[PDB]
Structure formats: C-alpha cells, structure tokens
Amino acid sequence: MIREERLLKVLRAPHVSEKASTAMEKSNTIVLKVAKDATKAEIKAAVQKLFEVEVEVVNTLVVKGKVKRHGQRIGRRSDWKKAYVTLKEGQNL
Amino acid sequence: KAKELREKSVEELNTELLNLLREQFNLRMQAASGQLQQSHLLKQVRRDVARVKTLLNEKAGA
Amino acid sequence: SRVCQVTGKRPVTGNNRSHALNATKRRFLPNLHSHRFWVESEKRFVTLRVSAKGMRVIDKKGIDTVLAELRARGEKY
Amino acid sequence: AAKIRRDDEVIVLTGKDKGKRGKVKNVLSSGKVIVEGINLVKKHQKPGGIVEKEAAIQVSNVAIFNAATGKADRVGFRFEDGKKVRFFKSNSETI
Amino acid sequence: KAXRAS
Amino acid sequence: KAXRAS
Amino acid sequence: MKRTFQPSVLKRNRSHGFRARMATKNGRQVLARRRAKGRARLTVS
RNA sequence: UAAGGUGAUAUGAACCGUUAUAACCGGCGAUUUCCGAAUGGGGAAACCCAGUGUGUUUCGACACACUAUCAUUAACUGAAUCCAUAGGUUAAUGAGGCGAACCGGGGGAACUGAAACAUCUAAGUACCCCGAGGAAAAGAAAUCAACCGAGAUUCCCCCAGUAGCGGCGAGCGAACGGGGAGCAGCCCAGAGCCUGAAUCAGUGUGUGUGUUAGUGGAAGCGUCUGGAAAGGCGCGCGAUACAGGGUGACAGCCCCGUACACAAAAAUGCACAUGCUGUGAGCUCGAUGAGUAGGGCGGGACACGUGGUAUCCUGUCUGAAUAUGGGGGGACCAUCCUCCAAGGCUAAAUACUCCUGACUGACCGAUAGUGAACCAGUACCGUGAGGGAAAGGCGAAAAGAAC
RNA sequence: AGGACCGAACCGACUAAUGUUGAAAAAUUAGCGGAUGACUUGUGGCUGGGGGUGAAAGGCCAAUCAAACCGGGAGAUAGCU
RNA sequence: CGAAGGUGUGCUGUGAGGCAUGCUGGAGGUAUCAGAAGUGCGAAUGCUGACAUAAGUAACGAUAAAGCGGGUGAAAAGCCCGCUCGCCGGAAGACCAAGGGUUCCUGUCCAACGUUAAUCGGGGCAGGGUGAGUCGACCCCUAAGGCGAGGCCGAAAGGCGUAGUCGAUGGGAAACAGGUUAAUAUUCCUGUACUUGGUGUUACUGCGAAGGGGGGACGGAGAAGGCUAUGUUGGCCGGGCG
RNA sequence: UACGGUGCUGAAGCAACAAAUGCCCUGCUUCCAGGAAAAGCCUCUAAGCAUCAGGUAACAUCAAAUCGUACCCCAAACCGA
Ligand SMILES: [K+]
Ligand SMILES: [K+]
Ligand SMILES: [K+]
Ligand SMILES: [K+]
Ligand SMILES: [K+]
Ligand SMILES: [K+]
Ligand SMILES: [K+]
Ligand SMILES: [K+]
Ligand SMILES: [K+]
Ligand SMILES: [K+]
C-alpha cells in the first residue's frame, strides 16, 4: 500500500516515440516519463490504480539531460526517469 | 476561494485534496498528450492544491 | 600541555642573549612534576601535574583548598 | 494613482499628432499609452503586408480632454464619499 | 516515497 | 573493528 | 610521452574534494577564501 | 493600493481582473527537498546505509518522530574493592559553524636601514593562533606632584623632535605641566540591627515617539524654426515647491516628484509611566586580599640597548611586615610628602563598516572608474592553492526593411 | 639450478641519420641493452620544502630545483641600466 | 537658423598656438578674470588594441595508393553506391577498465570549425536512444593506510593513538543460448535455468554469541599426464561442370 | 522488394587426427628468499530459552530495491594547447 497522493504524483507523461510505439504494439509495454525518485513498485502501483490495467513488470532507466546552447550560452536539460511498463497479456491501453 | 475551503472540515479538505490531485494528474496527461488547449488550468489546480494544504495545516495548527 | 594545574604556570617566551647581545628566541618551561597528593578527606591519592612552586602552594594552603580552587575553575583531577 | 486611464478621451500635446484626439486603448507600464488613431506606423509584417498600426505614445505627451472647455486639462485627485476621484484642474469638475 | 514537502 | 588495520 | 596529468576521479576527490578540504582548518580556510572571492566552483567536487 | 495584470531575455499562448480575494507594495503566518556546523552511522559535499519508538496496511508495505559530540546539573546505576570512587545509562540546559573591519590576548619574521655587518633597525610590523563585543580595552590611585597642590579611565591639541636612549651610529623618543572632549562611581573579603525600603536587571500592561506599505501635493498658453519644442519671440501664472529625474532639442506651470501637510490592521526599536517576580537601601559594629610585597638568577616591558638604573611583568630558587604596618617619590640613605598592592564591577568621550537609507563631490567616464557599466570572480589557465580576461551606445519610436 | 644463455611481448636508451619556426617543448627511422629478476606493470596508499626521496647524477619532488609552487611582508633593496 | 568631435581651406602671431570658414557631425559648448591639476610622449627589448612586413613565400602532419562508372548536388579527387586496386591483420581487428561525457542513431544545415572542396563530419540545429533478482556499483568483509569517542601529549593551532569506524587494487549468492532496434541488450522477447531472503503451512526437532574451533587462506620455479578451446582432413549434405 | 532490405521455407549437422600459454591444477615435484587479513561459510557450546522461541527439511507464496548501462577507449572522443 502506497498512498494515493503519492501514486498521483509519480506518473508524469506518456513518452511518445517510435521505440515506445513499437514497445506497445509488439511487447504490450507502455513507456512513461515518471518522477525521478519513482521506484518500480510505486510506478507499478500507480499504473494499476490510475490506468486500471494489470502490470506484469516495470523496467526503469534515467535519461541524462543534454547539454545545449541558447545564443552561445551553455545550459543543461534536466535528467528524467523513463519507465517501460509491461502490461499483463490482454490488458490493452 | 479560501473562504469556501475554510468552512470545510479536515476530512472534507482531504477529499478535496485528492480530487484536485486527481484532476491535476488528468490535466498533466492531457497537456503531455498535446490535448489540453487550456494551459491555464494547470496553474489553477496547482494553486488550489496549495490552498487546501495551507488550510489542512491551519486546521492541525502551526 | 606543560601547564601547572595549581598556579597555571605555562611556557613563556624570551631571548637567549649571547655576550655579543645576539637575541635568539627561547622558551622558559615551568618546573613541572606529576605528584600524587594524599587527600585525607577523600582518603585517596590525587595525581596533579604541578610546578615545584605549586607544591609549595599546596604545602602552604593545603591540598583541600587547592583542589577546591581547581573545581571552581573546572580543572580536572 | 494614474492620471490617464484606459477609455479616457485624450488630446495629444506633443509630436506629429499634436492637437489630435482619441480614446486611450491601453496603458503600458513603460509610461506610454496606445491612443486609437494616433501615432500610426507602417509595419512591414512578414507572412503578411504593410500594416498601419498605433505605436505607443509617452503618457506625458497626451492630456485629458475636458470636453466642456474643449481643451487639454490637467488631472488632480479628490476624495468624495470616502473614494478617490479624478477632477479637471481648470474647472474643478469630477472626471 | 514523500520526503521532498511530501 | 581492531589491532590488525582494524 | 607520459605527461603530468593522469586523471583519476577517486584521487582527485581524495586530494582536493570538498570533504578533504573540510577535514583540516587550512582546507576550511581555502573554502572560506574561495567563498569570499565568490567562486562558482568551490572545489573539484 | 488598484485599472490593470500572469518577474527577465521575450514574443506568443492560455487566462485573470476593472470598486474590490486581478496584479503590485508592506506586517504577521504557512510551506521551506538535498548538501553544508550537519548532528542516527558512513561518505569521493549535494550520496549510501541504519536503529528505536509510536501509528497505519491491501502483509507487499506505508507514515511520523526521535537517535551526533562535548560541557554543566540531576536522577538512576555501578569495578578492581569492603565502604567508596572511577565507570555506565537516561533527562534538562547550553555550546558547536559562518562573518569585512575595529578590539583584547597567545606566538612572531625577514627583506630593509645602518651606504658592508653582528648590537641596533625594520617591529611587536607582516603573518599564524585564541577569544569577545557593539564597540572592545582601560578605570576609581599602594597615581602624580613638590612642601603648593591635583584627584579614576579613555580620546584630541600642546609640551617636543625637547629630556633622554643610542655600535652616543643609523635611528628611537618620553614625562611633568597646560588646553580641550567626556565625566560617575561602586561592591565583596561580615555579621548585627532594622527590614525589604535604594538602584539597576527580568517579564507584562499602557503611553507617547520612530521604523517596516502609503495619501494629497501649486501654476501655460499663443506664435516661429524644426522630424519633434521643453528652444526663439510674445503675453500670463505658481513658488514654504526653481532639489532632481523624465518627456521626439534646453520645461517652475506636460509627467514623476519637490516644499509642505497627512497615514498603520500588524510587527517591532526607543523613551517614559505603572504592576508582578527576583534584587536588596540605611545605620552601628567591624574587617582590610601571602607563596603575596621584597630578594637571588635568567629574560621581557618601560622612550630608557644594564647603564650609576629607579619602576613594571615573571621562568627559576626564595620570602616579609600586614596600619604600632606597608608602597612610591628614577642608584642609595635620611627627612618630609603622598598613597594603600597582592579581590572585583562600571556608562560617556574613543575605534571600525560586511551591510541599510538619504545626500554630496574643482572624483572616473569604457585602455578610465571596481578585476567586473555587459549573465565576471564568468570564460579561460592551473593537479591544487591560486591566477584571471575581453566585451557598453540603431532610432524619438522598431516604424528592425511587406514586396 | 641460475641477479645463466639466444630471442618477441614488456622494460630500457649505446650509435647514426633525420628533425631543430619539429609530426613531437626530447621524437622518428635503422641498428642497440635487459628480458625469472637487485625484473616489470595496474590500482590505491605514505613521505612536504632547508623538508622529502635519492644503487648518489645535486638526481627527482606536476614541461619549474644548489632549496618547488601559490599567496602574502611587497612599491624588498637596486651608489646600476 | 547646427554644440563638441572629425576633415579640408584661408588668415594670423617670435613660438607653444590662435582666428575664420566649406564639408562631416547631430547636442552640446563656454568668453573673461581667477582657481585646481590624472596638464602635453617618439623612444623606456614600455603597456593594450589595431594593422603592416617577410608573402601569396613555407607548409597542408607518416611515401598504406589509388582508378573508373553511376548517384545526389549550385558545384564532387575527397560524400553515397558499385567494380577494381592497395594497406593492417598478436592489428591499423574485436571487447573493456581508466578517463571523457552525448562524441551514439536519425533528420536537417554548411556561416564558423575540418590545415583544400565538401553535398560529408566527432561541426551547427532538432528529435530520438541507455530497460537487469543473476553484469557492475551500492552492499557484507577486511589490506596498505586514513579518521578516531574517551585517552596520552603539545604556547594556541595541533600531534599520536584505544575502542571504534572507514578504506580495494583482494575475499563474499545466482543466467544461459537463440531472436530482435536506426540507435540497448547475459537488461527487451522466446526457450530453458539458477540464487538469497521474508512470510504461511506440514513434519520432525536442542536452540542459542560480542565467545571457542575449523575453514576461507594464499610463494617461486619446474615437470608430466589427462583434457578442452581451436584447427585440419575425411565423411555427409546442398550447389557447380566453368 | 520503397533495390536498403522484409516475409517464408530449410539439407547435412558426423568421424578421425592435431592441439594450447586455457582447464584438471589453490594440484604434483622441488627450492629458499619460507610466501595477506577479515567476513560469508561449517561446527561447538555460554548466559538465556525452555510443551515456546528457535533449528531442520518439504511445499506454497511473496520479495530481490537503488544507481550505472548510449558512444570512444593504443584513440580524431583519454593524457599531450
Ligand atoms: K637584519
Ligand atoms: K647599504
Ligand atoms: K514655444
Ligand atoms: K511630455
Ligand atoms: K523638468
Ligand atoms: K618572587
Ligand atoms: K610613607
Ligand atoms: K579590466
Ligand atoms: K625551500
Ligand atoms: K564642425
């Protein structure tokens, strides 16, 4: 049991890409941007509660932010956590 | 709006918090999907959450 | 440190002076000795690091007076 | 308080439009105002065309138009019914 | 989980 | 933890 | 030819890092001087 | 306080608001991740890993709080060792770290000067260290003086580059006394009587008075030149306001101000008035700081370099008299004068400015002025300490050049 | 067996040429020595400036060494240019 | 109705200078008499910036080496594709640690960067991309060594060190083959495994450590046998008849 | 076939010989210069617990977090401007 207030903060956005699209069509895996301090257990709990789908497993990685220049002034985008959430077979988001 | 929330109880404020957080989650998904046209609603719900949490702390006492 | 527990005598600095008046920095140390003092009140020996001068102070004032002074400074034995 | 406000009929004291009148359309924190019909510039707008549009004028270059006297006036502040009002300096009338 | 403050 | 050096 | 700078992040941090500086009064004086100068980067950390 | 507004580059989007919960400003609150004294343990700062107690659960878990060290006090416990003590645990309270100068203290150079150099100088400076405060320190005569007197300390001007000190070299350099700033005196070393009366502290209520937002705040037009008028010219007007800034060129009267007059729900500085809790005034009787003064040896400090060298401090070894007594008066003695050490507190005049507000300059104006007018202690260089730049200006308005 | 032998890796640096505003602030090319040892190498650690370390050359201690580097005394002093 | 500054011209004084005025400039300037100085530059191997000269000279960084056709393009010696050629192959291949930190992949652009051109790039810009019970870190354990409650020592700062506590370069559980993306894979997928721990249940039960013991747990050299990786040949299978 | 590559289908799949510097081998032999530590692990009991806790085995069930993972890596990406 994680508190719902916590679960309502952990999922930030669906990650849109060719790889994410292929993940959903081939492997029944949604790709999410999640809070940087989100654990696999919290992401699982949140997806099952909020999307109302059975989660099989969560795989996670931290995307390191890119160094970029805006008018010859150097900056760095933020690191963010990606979750590959594999839904149980036949759940279908 | 703090007028209205001040007249609610702790449990009434706690359900309003979860209602706003759920709306905040829904808006965040829409905005991420490129579906939210009304970008201003994100700030509104965020400040509403802050208002409810401020009053919850006032009810429990500083 | 080389500090008399009774008097607070500590190393002081000064000069060696040669016949030609060459000043070289030196120290003057206290004549310190660890000594076990009989305290008849407590029925105990108390070891103090004491200058020879401090031992004459203990002889004159008595160990109980001196130890009472140490307790007021918070200097330990 | 601001002497010149949105919707005021003003008269231009200074510049190419000296003497012309218009309604204050917006009051900027720069200390400038857009007065409708006044201080027209021809912007070369990219796709788009040549567009005549109002450029902001300095607020001290316009005066409140007292329609009674038919001339530029100065504004002062009074309290009436526990509320600050503007009044024309010349005739002492509330705006 | 939330130690940040929730 | 210790005379070995721990 | 082997040049003088042979980087090791461990040795860097142990030699010059924040905690090495904080460990001694002279290291804390380095940090005081660098704060007073207004350095963006106090240490190699 | 308000008709506008959602900080900047920086538009736009989507909104909010217009007579009062838009925004903005000020008071008081709330929230306030992680690192950092960093304090639950650890650690390559911003990370890793816990214990304990409560509470909660979907038994997978979740939430919250506490857990550093040292000092002091208290309780409890508890060796050798019988008492006891050391030790142990727990509780309360405090400390810790940072900070530009000024301040007191512990240490303490050398270059240099001496036309070399060692005494001496530089200098008790630089620097290191410890500690404090809004100032610090000093301070209520064992002080000077000179037979007349003064009356704590501190600071300023003189005395005076004098007297002196000095390889009598280089240099170092008083005091007495005078003029000022500012002034303030007290307590313990102890009982008794009388009582809590004096005076400052602490913590409240008022009371004014500052501060932290604000409010009102006078009076100009015509014409000429011009892209534009604030300029020229003409004729007016305000001024306890002609400080200053802005506005299309130079504005008392266009705007913001300025003189002047007002303002605080709330917090808070200060000065008083008045409770409460500590605090004890006054009188008589006393008492009167000992390993101390002084001495020998070694150093140091005194303007004073051991000198004929007083006086102060003390590392070392000694060691009085204690008011019928003792210190000082520049070797020393006598006489006389003067003061009372070995306990302590004490405002003001004095020092300083990291910082806040206002105001000023025969100060600078982009190679100047800060290193830095600009996203600069940055870029860049260096293992690191550390070093360390260059770089301002379209226009009145972007009207920043459709096609 | 061996501070044994020949010889790659590996460690070194005897000769020559080149290069010397280099490809390189010490190298390249052809030869050369050691190559089971007093060998060589990775990672980490310790020793600090009149100090270290040195099978000893005043060698080495961050391209710096008969006293490192950085900051300070500091505008040392300069009868010299 | 044109200030300073800039640039010409004329006049003028014994000189430093002065005056006038055309053009530029577009907002300041300032007589006189006094007052004050960051008050005058050609030198200092002066300092900063700019710009010359040598000079369109040297050089374009291993003498492993190119040739041609086609494509794209404004343009192709250099990019793409193709054929050929050459070079490395105990490497000039492959995988890592250290170190770096997006350089990876895709699209797009060619100013600057690339010692040439560049359509190309480790360059610009944008988007994408890193998936773990088993790999590694963290973690348990210690070495050198570090820190170190108390403590001992030291003018102060500090030094040393006990219990402790850190510290890998060493000791400590477990996953393989195949498939897959433009870009990850012992991480995804498929197939087949394994390890440690928590609960619950069933059966049987001496459990219990900060202590004891065992173990972990260790050198150099040499020799030989048994093996496998791996290779070669045959057989087999498919294709070939030049 | 969008000339890059996709989707499908699939034969044989054995033997002999040679063979490591890899494995048996933390072995064996031999030598002198005589070759970490600590935990995991196994075992023993102590005080204590004592029809329990706890042990053991079987089965079931849940858990195994967090961070790294791209790419270069004898190099055009690291140290050498
Ligand atoms: K000297
Ligand atoms: K000299
Ligand atoms: K006019
Ligand atoms: K104006
Ligand atoms: K003005
Ligand atoms: K004495
Ligand atoms: K006397
Ligand atoms: K500068
Ligand atoms: K030295
Ligand atoms: K001119």
Ligand SMILES: [K+]
């Ligand atoms: K003048």
Ligand SMILES: [K+]
């Ligand atoms: K010159």
Ligand SMILES: [K+]
């Ligand atoms: K040339």
Ligand SMILES: [K+]
């Ligand atoms: K070319």
Ligand SMILES: [K+]
């Ligand atoms: K793992």
Ligand SMILES: [K+]
């Ligand atoms: K971890």
Ligand SMILES: [K+]
């Ligand atoms: K043939």
Ligand SMILES: [K+]
């Ligand atoms: K990977």
Ligand SMILES: [K+]
């Ligand atoms: K690597």
Ligand SMILES: [Mg+2]
């Ligand atoms: Mg998985």
Ligand SMILES: [Mg+2]
């Ligand atoms: Mg992962």
Ligand SMILES: [Mg+2]
């Ligand atoms: Mg700590």
Ligand SMILES: [Mg+2]
């Ligand atoms: Mg901590």
Ligand SMILES: [Mg+2]
């Ligand atoms: Mg303090």
Ligand SMILES: [Mg+2]
């Ligand atoms: Mg000299």
Ligand SMILES: [Mg+2]
């Ligand atoms: Mg004081």
